[PDB]
Design a protein around this motif. Sequence first.
Motif, short mmCIF file in Angstrom:
data_model
loop_
_atom_site.label_atom_id
_atom_site.label_comp_id
_atom_site.label_asym_id
_atom_site.label_seq_id
_atom_site.Cartn_x
_atom_site.Cartn_y
_atom_site.Cartn_z
N UNK A 26 0.79 -1.05 -0.45
CA UNK A 26 -0.19 -0.01 -0.54
C UNK A 26 0.89 1.33 0.18
N UNK A 27 0.18 2.02 -0.46
CA UNK A 27 0.81 3.92 -0.79
C UNK A 27 0.78 4.08 0.66
N UNK A 45 8.57 0.78 3.11
CA UNK A 45 7.71 0.17 3.53
C UNK A 45 6.49 0.18 2.38
N UNK A 46 5.16 -1.33 3.16
CA UNK A 46 4.74 -0.62 2.31
C UNK A 46 3.10 -1.46 2.87
N UNK A 85 -4.25 -3.03 10.22
CA UNK A 85 -3.55 -3.19 9.21
C UNK A 85 -1.74 -3.46 9.86
N UNK A 86 -2.02 -4.88 8.33
CA UNK A 86 -0.94 -5.22 7.88
C UNK A 86 0.56 -4.91 7.25
N UNK A 87 1.62 -4.35 8.14
CA UNK A 87 2.74 -3.44 7.35
C UNK A 87 3.68 -4.36 6.83
N UNK A 88 3.89 -4.36 5.67
CA UNK A 88 4.89 -4.91 5.24
C UNK A 88 6.66 -4.11 5.14
#
Length: 185
Positions: A1-2, A184-185, A49-52
């Motif tokens: 995600x942005x 990060x995304x 949220x799922x943080x990558x």
Amino acid sequence: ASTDYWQNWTDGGGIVNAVNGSGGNYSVNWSNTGNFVVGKGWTTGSPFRTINYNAGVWAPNGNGYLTLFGWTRSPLIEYYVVDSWGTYRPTGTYKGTVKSDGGTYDIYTTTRYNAPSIDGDRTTFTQYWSVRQSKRPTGSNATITFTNHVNAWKSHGMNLGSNWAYQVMATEGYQSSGSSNVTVW
């Protein structure tokens, strides 16, 4: 995600060369600093949220954390999900553990007294922590399923505020030097 938020705060000590890269990429070069926090993420945090992220470079030369970082208001709480660190592993009052994204994290709570907060000025606030038992390898695509932490914290009476502030994958340092490069995304 942005990502839509850029976090770049320093208490003014030493050198902090933070670069706002393309997309969700950012880098930091720091030297003989005081306390600072740099990272990219979202203006409004979310418990679902799922943080990558991918830390292409994680080279702290002292006290530094590679960690999910965020705030909530009502009440004022600072939270962390620490995947890696430098010479010092953060700890506090042990609550329990949580297994998430292939790792096991210890749950801790701490309190900060007369310290700078998100609203500026100084105050006393609680901190929620999830700290990996062992450093997570970097250079690979990593995921932080935040809901697992939020739920685990709840089971220990660690409830977050109702007003969500920013949420970012950051690099935090304290009186140290080093380098980092994270996407990060």
